[PDB]
Every structure is written in structure tokens, then in C-alpha cells.
Amino acid sequence: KENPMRELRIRKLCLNICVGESGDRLTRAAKVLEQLTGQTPVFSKARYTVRSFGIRRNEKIAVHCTVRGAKAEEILEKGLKVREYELRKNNFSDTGNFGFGIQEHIDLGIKYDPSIGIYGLDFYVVLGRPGFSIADKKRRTGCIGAKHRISKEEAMRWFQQKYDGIILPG
Amino acid sequence: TNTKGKRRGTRYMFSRPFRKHGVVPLATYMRIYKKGDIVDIKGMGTVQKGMPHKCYHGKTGRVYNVTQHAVGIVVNKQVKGKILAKRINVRIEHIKHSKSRDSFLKRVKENDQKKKEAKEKGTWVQLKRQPAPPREAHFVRTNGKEPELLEPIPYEFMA
Amino acid sequence: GFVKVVKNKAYFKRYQVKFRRRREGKTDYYARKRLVIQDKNKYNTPKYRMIVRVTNRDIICQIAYARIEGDMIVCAAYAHELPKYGVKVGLTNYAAAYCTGLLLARRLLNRFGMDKIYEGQVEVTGDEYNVESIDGQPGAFTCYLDAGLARTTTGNKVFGALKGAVDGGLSIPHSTKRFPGYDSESKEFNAEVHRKHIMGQNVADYMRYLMEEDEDAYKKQFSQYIKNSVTPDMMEEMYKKAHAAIRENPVYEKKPKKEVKKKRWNRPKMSLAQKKDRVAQKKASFLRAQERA
Amino acid sequence: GRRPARCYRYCKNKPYPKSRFCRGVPDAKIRIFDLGRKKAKVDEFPLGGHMVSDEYEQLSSEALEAARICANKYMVKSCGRDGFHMRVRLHPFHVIRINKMLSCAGADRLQTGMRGAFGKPQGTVARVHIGQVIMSIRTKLQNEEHVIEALRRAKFKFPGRQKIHISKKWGFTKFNADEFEDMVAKKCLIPDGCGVKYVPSHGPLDKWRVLHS
RNA sequence: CGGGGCGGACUGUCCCCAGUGCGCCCCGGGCGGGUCGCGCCG
RNA sequence: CUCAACCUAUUCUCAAACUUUAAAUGGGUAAGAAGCCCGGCUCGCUGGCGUGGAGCCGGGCGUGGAAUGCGAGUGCCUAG
RNA sequence: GACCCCAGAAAAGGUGUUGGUUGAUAUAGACAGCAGGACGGUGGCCAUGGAAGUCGGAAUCCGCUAAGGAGUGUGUAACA
RNA sequence: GAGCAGAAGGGCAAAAGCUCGCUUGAUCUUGAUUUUCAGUACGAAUACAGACCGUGAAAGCGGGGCCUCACGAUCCUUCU
RNA sequence: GUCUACGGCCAUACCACCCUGAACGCGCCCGAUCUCGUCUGAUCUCGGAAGCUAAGCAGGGUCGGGCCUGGUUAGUACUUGGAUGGGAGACCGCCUGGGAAUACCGGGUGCUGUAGGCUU
RNA sequence: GUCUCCGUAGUGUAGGGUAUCACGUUCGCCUAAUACGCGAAAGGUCCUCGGUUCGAAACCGGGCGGAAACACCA
Ligand SMILES: [K+]
Ligand SMILES: [K+]
Ligand SMILES: [K+]
Ligand SMILES: [K+]
Ligand SMILES: [K+]
Ligand SMILES: [Mg+2]
Ligand SMILES: [Mg+2]
Ligand SMILES: [Mg+2]
Ligand SMILES: [Mg+2]
Ligand SMILES: [Mg+2]
Ligand SMILES: [Mg+2]
Ligand SMILES: [Mg+2]
């Protein structure tokens, strides 16, 4: 009934880890993303100086990576397994894309190394349909259109159908 | 007391018209400016290079020199009690062809051709344009309708 | 409602739309001005430019000059007329880009009558070639490449079209930094792997590459190459024959077709009377439905 | 310490509003512009009376405050506290200046005379034109004589000549009284608060069907 | 102020329910301008 | 239940250093013979081209190409 | 009171007089004068020390009626 | 509704803003012109022309800063 | 009747939502050996042709917003010139010419150039 | 009116990258007890608002207070 070009699918998984300050902590956090994603992470500087958070401007504060393709799908199932395939409905967003956070990186895949820290990580998957790339395109870029957009309700079905997930009322 | 700055008092003159900012349309670059043609000096503010001074905005002159991007214009300026012909270099963004000279050239072509046709068939035709003559006599028909009688209205206080 | 509506009535009242072709994402008016505008002291001398546009399935090569009423195209060549001679499959690649650029060059020179003079580089080599005007003969046609919005990195197909045109006889200012043979680290143009790209040897290697690792993947990728048996070993000869056929007959003939009816496929605009009747009916239906309760 | 109002009666200067160039302006004397039962609906107070100026002049914020109080006390006396609604329709947006000279027996003490004479903000006045409405009162239709007398008393607090006019509009609306009721009947007008909303016969029909439903 | 016959499109009356426009031809009434125009009157 | 903030559609009153819109008066230019139209020649400038542009040389066109009024142009010396 | 500039006056008033606008009453007898009636519940309720129609807060009704306001003012401590 | 060094005004969106890459046209020259104006100078600016370069695939753009301010005769000294 | 490439004017063209789209086309789409770029073949670059018009795109619709153009507002506001006009003034009237702008009420919703396709 | 300077622990004061000193206050020691003395702790919108800045007590514009110096020649 539905067109094959309307099928929902994962655009990117967008792992992010934010630490307080630049230092060995950030470098070891970068290795944490590198081992999980098999991919070189990128550091993010602080936009402003905040004395309360003890961060200075243009200081490396966080490390983040974007994972696409089958690699993203395999990372998502590990993280969902940490949350026992149970996502709260507030986590799903109005734009049609959801995210969850994992407190401990060590539990899934990677053995703890004494050099490596105890860092957790942040998941935010972006859900898309075929043809969403027209917005990114340089030539003749355009908006996707209302019917082709993904709603919060559609994302919730996708989790409930693909991962037999449970959306708790929270 | 007033400053002598080149752009003093040009807040509105060099500003763009409402909802006509941004990219300059390219037909203004494709216009052809020969020597001896008459151009009006606007002076748009989007292009800051080759701008005319504020005293030439709204003036009309004759092109005497053509360069890669600008033209040389002989334009009359009045200084106290003397009018003297200034020569100014203005980029083509700030000028456009004057239609006063274009309409007169059309009329000359009509006049010269009309004279030619008149000689070929014989009789005489009027070439000069005359001032609006007094209205000729005419009849105005009532058409069986009495003209409506108008009356000044009484005054009463609006608001 | 808890946040100010940004796109309120006042937002649209002050909104200035961009140019139509800027809104469509087709024309870079910053680059277009520098490409189409002639010096005022050159007057009505045309400024020619080679428009190269690579489509998902086609390559379009046009030569045009700007006029106030719009661009005037003096000659056009397409990659979809390549099957008229030799190459019928694997269009919109670098080799086809060279062929359509060469076809545009030969077709334009034929129309102007300058084929015997300015033969161009008949023997295809990737090295830098530039045509020089011959004294006592009409000058070489000079035009400039209009890449459009394409990212002009090394190995872009728009430069393959440029290479075909300059080898065809057109004088287009360029350098070899953007040809596939250019080496970034050594700042050296190989001029031999560029010739391989012109002959589609990168594609030919890919076909014989995919043959030895995964057979069905090769069939998936080069499915239409299998039809009419276009094999890696015959690709260079196919492109040489295509170039020679371009040289011999570059003239374009059009298919006539007038045996067409006026079938209208778009709904016509509704008239004012129909709009008011529709509102009248909808008003009446709502009131009538209310009386049903 | 205020000068006599005759010194600032006439609109002699260009408008001089309180802005980023005119700083340090003392607040105006009048801070309240609506009194009475402001929450009364449009049908409650059909009759509207205006005070209209015949003179192009300046009205001080103190005078507007005095006339607003004078009209309020009489209406409360004659119509009850909830029997009317008054709207002052002039806001003192024009700042008047004073070039203050030392009022001592000596010009030697840096009176400076007329040097650097541009004054400091001294007050705010409202610029009124001929035919402009100064004050408006809406009430029931049997209080017409009380509206006229209340507006008559407030005239004595103003410099120039003012006329009392009983408008043909319904209340504070801009629609005629005789066409007001049937316009509401055919839903051209919809009441909100103390005013009405004109509903044009254009726009989406979805708003047309929320009416008539 | 409108009449006849064929293509689209609209309405929550959808039993051949109701309504609107356009493309061709056949008619009906009124109005204005030119017409060797043609007569009569001044 | 009420009072706030917020949003939405309205409502009163304003701007020398605000503005979508926008006069009257006003400023510039044009209303021909130094013009128009035919041919031709030169160029080291321009150039796909007999191109483009400019200059030069001959020839033909007077219904003198709005009104009104007035004779104009030009130089030196120069007081107060 | 008495003529451009110009040489002195405002707000606010007048049952002086003249003109005008709007509204109202009137032979089913207006207006003004002179002469009678101007009641019962009810000295209506809450305020109280007396407040009875008249120092005040709310209400504003009934009957006889031709007509009487559960009150316009004088007055009384309140009455009268 | 940001930013473009600063006062304000104008201008600017695959910009003139932000980030990268390569660079030194912020270089050597003659005239013309604009602005103030006496139509003198300085300062600033515009359009060219001749070199030598930078950048880009190229068209092109660049002889300082997006534009409106940011500066200095004779005599003398100092350097090239 | 339409589309593609390049455009001119730059909303009658924009914005929101809905419906339809035959054939070419334009796309979405598949892939990363080569060219070339990425934290990520997402973008860019390259090689393709299984699928799809869902989306872009085109046409249409909406008592749609905006925009464009009319009427009204209104010969009103304002204004050139004139008077030994009025008025204590503030200001106002008249003569002589010119003459707007909201609210409110209608109509319209891209035209078109060059080159090349599809449409029995 | 003109011109200049200063607002920081309870007091008097120092000083564009997490606020100093002394007195004072609190707690514990010594003393029969207080004081002295000894050992520890706490205390500060840097007058207010706006701006520059990554960052303001600081730097700049304002506004609140306080302290100065002037106002002469007839
Ligand atoms: K000044
Ligand atoms: K000034
Ligand atoms: K100068
Ligand atoms: K160059
Ligand atoms: K020297
Ligand atoms: Mg510059
Ligand atoms: Mg570019
Ligand atoms: Mg006094
Ligand atoms: Mg003044
Ligand atoms: Mg140069
Ligand atoms: Mg509309
Ligand atoms: Mg007039």
C-alpha cells in the first residue's frame, strides 16, 4: 500500500560525549568514541566562557561523532540493549527523531582499560525517508514537503515495530 | 557648520527602494553606452565604487568617454551664478539611458519619413507640434434627460 | 500558542523574494555577472561562454552569449545524441563528457565555416593543448567555461567537456590543475592517466575489476553494459571511433513531428464564477447539514 | 515650580518626544486614561459623548489629569460608579523645555544669559488639533444630560475652546448606532470586551462556519 | 434579460442529486460607432 | 477558582534625528542642418566573422521640425 | 465705537437686544398667577441617643386614586 | 531581527558576514577627473593607461580596509 | 499542452496546506575501483540504472495570508500664487491652480527570449 | 550654575583572570575570673543601570550620594 520510497530509516546516529575540560580526559574520551565507532572523533570547542562550568572560550570541551549506514544500526542495538529497548515518549521529538543516553560505555563492547576512563555517552538517532537529501544538496535544493516529513507518532511506531520496543508513559 | 563629508545628507537618496535590495539585476550591466548619448545619473547605493557625488544625482549629461566599467559624462553643474560643464566618471550601475532623447529621435524618424511620403503622394502635412488649442464648438445632447440639480449639503459635525 | 509566530502578516509584507533562478537554486548570480558582462568599451562584441551541465543521466554543453532579452545559444551538444555514433551506453561519465565537448566544438566550427583551419588535437593525448590563431585566417573561437554550481575539484566532468572542446579547436583559457592526471602533492600533471580517463579506462578497469571479486555485483553495476556487449577491452576503440565519427559529421539534424493532437493534460484555472458557486454550495451544504442536526 | 500654562500653550516647536535623544524626562502627571466600568460590554453603554477641541494648541499633562478627575467625580455622583466608562484620548508625548535662570539678585553669578540656552525637560503636553477628541464617555442612553454636564465641567480645566458632541457611533466603536444592532444580528460585528470585531466576508470558510455554528 | 443541442469541473440534497465556466454552430432583445449609407424636416 | 507572565485577534494615542505609501512648489535634460539618411576609406584599439567602435572622405535631403519675447558673442582695465 | 502694519486685552458671565438650532407642552385646555388636595401600610429596613420623608447605606413597592415622591427644600433635639 | 575594528547613516546572504587555502595590488609610474572650491592647495576619492605580480579552472578581481573621517606648506634636516 | 539547459524582468512568480501528473525529461535512487573530499561516500567528487513519483518539480485548488492592480476614503488632507479677508490671538474662510495616504470594498495570482525534447 | 575627585568585610582602608591588612565577631586554650597572650574559623551585588570584552570591582558612558575648588570688573 505504502510507496517503497516512504520507508523510514536511520540517517545518522550522532554519538556525543561532553566532558568538563580539555585534557587527558577528553583524549581518552576520544578513544572511547573511536573504539565504538571505528571512526576518528572530532572535538568541539566551547562557544562562550562560563565560570560556573569552569570552561573557557575556544576550549575543547566535548568529542562527538556521526555514524551512518549499517555501522549506525549496530551501534543503536547495543545502546538500546542498555536501555532494555524501553524509551520514554518524551525522548522522541517533534521533528521525528529520538535520542537516549548511556551512563557507562564499558558495559557494551569495550573492556575497561585502566588507562581508559569510565565515561558515558549520548545517543541521538536521526530518522529519515528517501529523498531527505534534497535539502542538503547544493544545486536545486528544496524542502521535503509535509507528507514526506516524519512525525513524533511515526517515529514511535518505527521503534515499536523494528525493535519490539516499549514506549513508557514518561 | 555643516560637515563637508562626501555622503552627508545621502541617507535616503542612496538607499535602496523598499523590497529592492540585494543582487543588482544584470540588464543594467548589459546596456550599451555610446559616445554622445544622454544618460540620467541615479546613483544606487548597493555599489560603492564609481559613485557620483550627491550633486549629480538626478542630473542628466552626455557621455564622452567609455571605459571597461564606467563612462565619462559631461553634466552641467550650477555653482553660485555660473553654470559650468563638469566631467565625471560614473560606473554604469549609477546611470541609465534618458528616454527624453530616445522619444525625440523617434519623432525625427517619423518626421523625416513623413516628409518623404508627403512628397511622394503630393499634399502638405503638419510637422510641428502645436500647443493644446482652445476647444472647438460642439453640441452637447440632453438625450431626453434633464440635467441633475445639485445643491450644497447642510453642515453637520463629523467627528 | 506560547511563542511569537515568526511568519506573521508583517513578515510577508516586508519579505523580498530572491531572483527566480536563485530561488530555484540554478543560477549563481555572483559568478554569472563576472562571466556574461562585457567591457563597456567593447560595446556589442559578444562574450561567449561554454555552459557545461552534468545531469543524472545526460550531459548538456551549450555556447551562449548574454543579451538583455535573455541568453542566446548559438550551438548546443548533448550526451544523449552520442548513440548516433559508437558510444551508446555509459553516458554522463568523463569519457562521454570529452565526447560531447568535442562534438560541441566540431559542430560550432562547422557552422562558422572554420573546420579545415583549427583542426584541434586530432590524436587524443591528455597533455595541455591550446589552439593558436593562424595569421591571414579568421581568429580562433574564444569562449570561457561556465561551471555553474559544480564544485570544480580535480577530475570534475565539466573539465572533461572543456578538454574535448579545446582539443576540438575552441580557444578556452584553462590550466591542467583540474584534470584527472594532476598530482596534488607533487604539483605535476601526469597527462597519461588523464588520457586513460578520456578513453574511459578507469571504467574499463572497474568492469574487469568487478569481474574477479563478485560476478553478480558486476552484473548489478554494469547491467546495460552487458546489453550489446560493451566489454572493457573494446572501450578505447569505441571512443576512438566515436571521436573520428564526431570529426567527420558534427552537423545536427532534427526529427520532424507535427502529427500531434491538442490533448491537454493540466487542469485549467477555475473561473471566478466557479469559485463563487463553490463557496455558495459549501455555505448551503453547511447550513443544510445543521438543519439535519 | 511649574510655569503658567500660557507659556506653553501653542504648538511652536516640532514634536519633541521622549526618546534616546531626549533623556531625563519627568513622568507625566496623568497615568490613567480609562476609568469607570472599563469591563462593560458594547451593548451596555450605547451612548457616547466627546469633548472636541476647536483650537490647535498644547494641553498639559496636568490639565488632562485635572479634567479627568473632574469628570470622574461628577459621573460617579450622577450615574453611580459602574454607570459609565471614560477614556482620555490624548497622551502627553511632547516634552516642553525650560531654560532655567537663577532667580537671585545677580546676573554676575553665571546667569550666562542666552548662551547655551537649550533647555532641560520640564514637562509633557499633548498636542491637539481642531476637531480632535480630547475625552470620551460612554454610558447608558438615559444619562445623556449627565455626560454633557460632566464634559462641560471638565472644559474649565483646559486653556482654549472645546465643544461637547454626542456622537452617532455606538459606544466607543467606529460603527454607526443605527446600523449597529442589525450588523450584530447578521454577525458582521462580534463583541469582545468593550469593543467589537468586524468580520469581513473574506478569509477561510472555516472561520465562517465557526460562526453560524 | 436570455434560449438549443457536446468536453471539463463543483456541492454533505449524490436515483440520471443540484449548480458554474469555457471551445463551435443555430437563434432572441436592447445599446453605441462607422456606413456611396438612404429619405423627411429646420 | 483567581491573579500574573506568554501568545492570538482587536483597541486608544504618537515621532526633528521612524516609515510601506506620498503630494503642491521645485531641480536636470531634450524639442535638429554640429540633424537625418546613403555609400566609401583608415586604425597599431577590439575581434570567430565582411566583428565592434572611433575617426576621416564624398553625396542627397529645408515643411528651419512647440509657444512667447528679445539683437548677440567676446576681451582688457577696474572703483566701491 | 470708529479701518492693513498699528500702537492695547483673555478666560468667564448677562432674564440688554437681535437672529438661528434642537426639543417640549397646549381647547382631551397649556404657561404664569390666585385657590383647594398633596394620603394608608409606613414613625418603610440598617445605621441609634432622636433621627418620624428630609445627618447618613441600600433598596424605589401596593391600594385610594385625579394625585401624592415610602420624599425638593425650610424648620424641629426629635416632633409638629 | 547577526556580523562587517570604532560614532552614526547607507550597503551587503551559495554577500561585503564566518572558516579555510595561497598570497603581498598596502608594490613601480605618467597624466585626467571628483570632492572643498577661488573651481587654488592639502587630504580623501573615482575612472583609465603603462610595468611587475597575487589569486582562481576561468571569466575576472586586486594597486589597502564595503562607503561616508582618521590628517600637514615654504625653509631646514635625514634616508633612498 | 508541456518539460529540460541557459536566461530577462525579479512575489500576478512568495508562504501554508490539499489534489493530480500520460510521454520524454528532471529527479529521488544504487554503489565507492578509479578522480576528489569527508569525524561520517550525509554533502562534494566519481561509476551506474534495480526501484519510485513518496519527495523535489509542474499544473490546479483555498469566501487562505502576502503581493499586484482598481474603487472608496476624497476633491478630503496638504499645497503655488492673491487680498487694507475674519479673528485679541490660536487659527480659519474665500479667490487662483495642483491634489494625496490608511481603514473598508472589488479584480488578478507570472509574462517572456534562445537552443533542444515529449505529446497520433 | 561651572569644574574636579571618591563610593570595596561591621569600622578605617589596599588592590581586565577565584579579593588584602588591621581592628572588630565566633570557637577552643591559659587564668579562680576578666583583660593580655596562644591556637583556628567566618565576614565582603567592590553604590546602581547600560555598554566594550571570552571575562569588568577594574575600562567607558549614564543615574544616585559624599567631598572639594570657582562665581570677578563696574
Ligand atoms: K548643522
Ligand atoms: K552636523
Ligand atoms: K584635489
Ligand atoms: K591573471
Ligand atoms: K627631502
Ligand atoms: Mg575601496
Ligand atoms: Mg564560483
Ligand atoms: Mg506670575
Ligand atoms: Mg522653537
Ligand atoms: Mg594595471
Ligand atoms: Mg486573498
Ligand atoms: Mg486652494
Residue D167 at interface with chain B, using a CB cutoff of 8 Å: yes
Kindly list the distances between the CA atom of residue C200 and the CA atoms of B109, C92, D157, in Å, as whole numbers in the listed order. 62, 11, 98
Q: How many CB atoms lie within 10 A of CB A96?
A: 20
Kindly list the distances between the CA atom of residue B27 and the CA atoms of B17, B52, C69, C71, D47, in Å, as whole numbers in the listed order. 18, 20, 8, 11, 62
**Which residues neighbour C273 within 8 Å (Cβ) at sequence distance 6 or greater?**
none
Residue C279 at interface with chain D, using a CB cutoff of 8 Å: yes
Residue recorded with cell 525517508? A129
**Which residues neighbour B100 within 8 Å (Cβ) at sequence distance 6 or greater?**
B38, B60
Distance of CA C166 to the CA centre of its chain: 17
Q: Which three cell numbers stand for residue A93?
A: 521529538
Helix residue spans in C37-156 (DSSP H): 94-112
Task: Give the β-pairing of D189-192 and A99-102.
Answer: unpaired
Q: Which three cell numbers stand for residue D195?
A: 469593543
Report resolution in angstroms: 2.2
Q: Which three cell numbers stand for residue D180?
A: 449597529
Establish whether chain A is in contact with chain C, requiring a minimum of 3 CB pairs below 8 angstroms. yes
C41 min Cα distance to partner chain B (Å): 5
In 3D space, the residue among D63, D79, D94, D37 whose CA is nearest the CA of residue D159 turns out to be D63
Q: DSSP label at C139? A: P
**Which residues neighbour A24 within 8 Å (Cβ) at sequence distance 6 or greater?**
none
What b/e sequence results for A124-150 when a residue is b if at least 16 CB atoms lie within 10 Å of its CB, and e otherwise?
A: bbbbbbeebeeeeeeeeeeeeeeeeeb
User: For residues C129 and C167, what is the distance between their CA atoms, to the nearest angstrom?
Assistant: 7
Which residues share a beta bridge with A100?
Answer: A123
Residue recorded with cell 571605459? B67
User: For residues C36 and C45, what is the distance between their CA atoms, to the nearest angstrom?
Assistant: 12
Residues 40-69 of C with CB under 7 A from strand F: 42-46, 48
Residue D116 region by backbone torsions, left for phi larger than 0, else alpha for psi between -120 and 50, else beta: left
Residue C283 at interface with chain D, using a CB cutoff of 8 Å: yes
Q: Burial of C66 by CB count in 10 Å (0-12 exposed, 13-18 middle, 19+ buried)?
A: buried
In 3D space, the residue among D6, D52, D57 whose CA is nearest the CA of residue D162 turns out to be D52
In 3D space, the residue among D4, D28, D160 whose CA is nearest the CA of residue D94 turns out to be D28
Kindly list the distances between the CA atom of residue A44 and the CA atoms of A16, A24, A25, A71, in Å, as whole numbers in the listed order. 10, 15, 14, 23
In 3D space, the residue among A2, A4, A6, A46 whose CA is nearest the CA of residue A128 turns out to be A6
Which nucleotide is the nearest neighbour of D106, by CA and C1'?
A: J71
User: For residues B68 and A4, what is the distance between their CA atoms, to the nearest angstrom?
Assistant: 57
In Å, the largest CA–CA distance within chain A is 57
**Which residues neighbour C245 within 8 Å (Cβ) at sequence distance 6 or greater?**
C85, C86
- Between chain C and chain D, the number of residue pairs with CB atoms below 8 A apart is 9
Long-range contacts of A18-23 (CB under 8 A, 24+ apart): A18/A61, A18/A62, A18/A122, A19/A61, A19/A62, A19/A63, A19/A119, A20/A53, A20/A54, A20/A55, A20/A61, A21/A54, A21/A55, A21/A59, A21/A61, A22/A59, A22/A60, A22/A61
Residues 103-122 of D with CB under 7 A from strand F: none
For the CA of C250 and the C1' of F33, the distance in angstroms is 55
Contact B126, B109 (CB under 8 A): no
> Identity (one letter) of the amino acid at C98?
Y
Kindly list the distances between the CA atom of residue C227 and the CA atoms of A90, B9, C89, C236, C239, in Å, as whole numbers in the listed order. 54, 75, 9, 18, 17
Q: How was this structure determined?
A: cryo-EM
User: For residues C152 and D104, what is the distance between their CA atoms, to the nearest angstrom?
Assistant: 84
Q: What's the length of chain D?
A: 213
* Ligand 2 mean position, distance from CA B8 (Å): 9
Helix residue spans in A68-135 (DSSP H): 70-82
- Residue D160 phi/psi, 5° resolution? -95, -150
User: For residues A41 and D144, what is the distance between their CA atoms, to the nearest angstrom?
Assistant: 82
User: For residues A97 and A11, what is the distance between their CA atoms, to the nearest angstrom?
Assistant: 10
User: For residues B41 and A76, what is the distance between their CA atoms, to the nearest angstrom?
Assistant: 66
* Residue whose CA is minimally distant from E18 C1': C281
- Residue D196 phi/psi, 5° resolution? -125, 155
User: For residues A160 and A166, what is the distance between their CA atoms, to the nearest angstrom?
Assistant: 6
B155 min Cα distance to partner chain C (Å): 40
Residue C136 region by backbone torsions, left for phi larger than 0, else alpha for psi between -120 and 50, else beta: left
User: For residues B44 and D61, what is the distance between their CA atoms, to the nearest angstrom?
Assistant: 46
For the CA of A16 and the C1' of I34, the distance in angstroms is 34
User: For residues A2 and A161, what is the distance between their CA atoms, to the nearest angstrom?
Assistant: 16
C14 min Cα distance to partner chain B (Å): 7
* Ligand 5 mean position, distance from CA D90 (Å): 73
Nearest to D205 among C282, C287, C290 (CB): C282
Q: Burial of C97 by CB count in 10 Å (0-12 exposed, 13-18 middle, 19+ buried)?
A: buried
User: For residues B86 and B77, what is the distance between their CA atoms, to the nearest angstrom?
Assistant: 6
In 3D space, the residue among C81, C69, C65 whose CA is nearest the CA of residue C251 turns out to be C81
Kindly list the distances between the CA atom of residue D207 and the CA atoms of C9, C247, C285, D119, D213, in Å, as whole numbers in the listed order. 18, 70, 16, 56, 10
Helix residue spans in C130-271 (DSSP H): 157-168, 193-198, 201-213, 215-221, 223-226, 235-248
C154-C155-C160-C166 Cα dihedral, nearest 10 degrees = 30
Q: Which three cell numbers stand for residue C142?
A: 574564444
**Which residues neighbour A71 within 8 Å (Cβ) at sequence distance 6 or greater?**
A37, A38, A39
The alpha-carbon radius of gyration of chain A (Å, integer) is: 18
Contact C78, C95 (CB under 8 A): no
Which residue of B20, B26, B37, B93 is the best one to mutate when testing the C interface, meaning the one whose CB has the most C CBs within 10 A? B26
Strand F bases with any atom < 7 A from protein Cβ: 6-17, 19-21, 26-32, 35-37, 46-55, 61-63, 65-67
Q: DSSP label at C12? A: H
DSSP of D94-156: EEEEE-----SS-STTT--TTTT-PPEEEEEEEEE-TT-EEEEEEE-GGGHHHHHHHHHHHHT
For the CA of B53 and the C1' of H74, the distance in angstroms is 34
User: For residues C159 and C153, what is the distance between their CA atoms, to the nearest angstrom?
Assistant: 9
Establish whether chain B is in contact with chain A, requiring a minimum of 3 CB pairs below 8 angstroms. no
User: For residues C65 and C49, what is the distance between their CA atoms, to the nearest angstrom?
Assistant: 7
DSSP of chain B: -----TTTT-TTTSSPPTT--SSPPTHHHH----TT-EEEE---SS--TTPPPTTTTTEEEEEEEE-SSEEEEEEEEEETTEEEEEEEEEEGGGEEE-HHHHHHHHHHHHHHHHHHHHHHH------SPPP-PPPPP-----TT-PPPPP-PPPP----
In 3D space, the residue among D119, D97, D134 whose CA is nearest the CA of residue D15 turns out to be D97
* Ligand 3 mean position, distance from CA B39 (Å): 26
Residue recorded with cell 548489478? C220
Establish whether chain B is in contact with chain D, requiring a minimum of 3 CB pairs below 8 angstroms. yes
Residue B68 to residue C36, Cβ atoms within 8 A: no
User: For residues A122 and A99, what is the distance between their CA atoms, to the nearest angstrom?
Assistant: 8
In 3D space, the residue among A90, A70, A101, A80 whose CA is nearest the CA of residue A165 turns out to be A80
User: For residues A48 and A52, what is the distance between their CA atoms, to the nearest angstrom?
Assistant: 12
Q: Residue B47: nearest ligand to its CA?
A: 6
In 3D space, the residue among C230, C235, C201 whose CA is nearest the CA of residue C218 turns out to be C230
User: For residues C96 and C163, what is the distance between their CA atoms, to the nearest angstrom?
Assistant: 11
Nearest to B22 among C16, C33, C43 (CB): C16
Dihedral sign for Cα atoms in the order D73, D78, D84, D87: negative
Kindly list the distances between the CA atom of residue A7 and the CA atoms of A55, A125, C271, in Å, as whole numbers in the listed order. 43, 16, 40
Strand G bases with any atom < 7 A from protein Cβ: 11-12
Q: How many CB atoms lie within 10 A of CB C79?
A: 24
User: For residues C199 and C125, what is the distance between their CA atoms, to the nearest angstrom?
Assistant: 10
The alpha-carbon radius of gyration of chain B (Å, integer) is: 26
**Which residues neighbour B47 within 8 Å (Cβ) at sequence distance 6 or greater?**
B24, B91, B93, B94
User: For residues A156 and A165, what is the distance between their CA atoms, to the nearest angstrom?
Assistant: 9
Dihedral sign for Cα atoms in the order B115, B117, B122, B127: negative
Which residues share a beta bridge with C51?
Answer: C62, C146
Contact D195, D172 (CB under 8 A): yes
Residue B33 to residue C40, Cβ atoms within 8 A: yes
In 3D space, the residue among D13, D30, D31 whose CA is nearest the CA of residue D97 turns out to be D13
CA neighbours within 13 Å on the CB side: how many for A56?
Answer: 2
In 3D space, the residue among C136, C114, C115, C128 whose CA is nearest the CA of residue C172 turns out to be C128
Which residues lie near ion ligand 7 (Cβ < 5 Å)?
C 31
> Identity (one letter) of the amino acid at C131?
V
In 3D space, the residue among B6, B92, B95, B89 whose CA is nearest the CA of residue B42 turns out to be B95
User: For residues C272 and C280, what is the distance between their CA atoms, to the nearest angstrom?
Assistant: 12
Contact B63, B42 (CB under 8 A): no
Q: DSSP label at C239? A: H
Kindly list the distances between the CA atom of residue D173 and the CA atoms of A7, C131, D196, in Å, as whole numbers in the listed order. 57, 83, 7
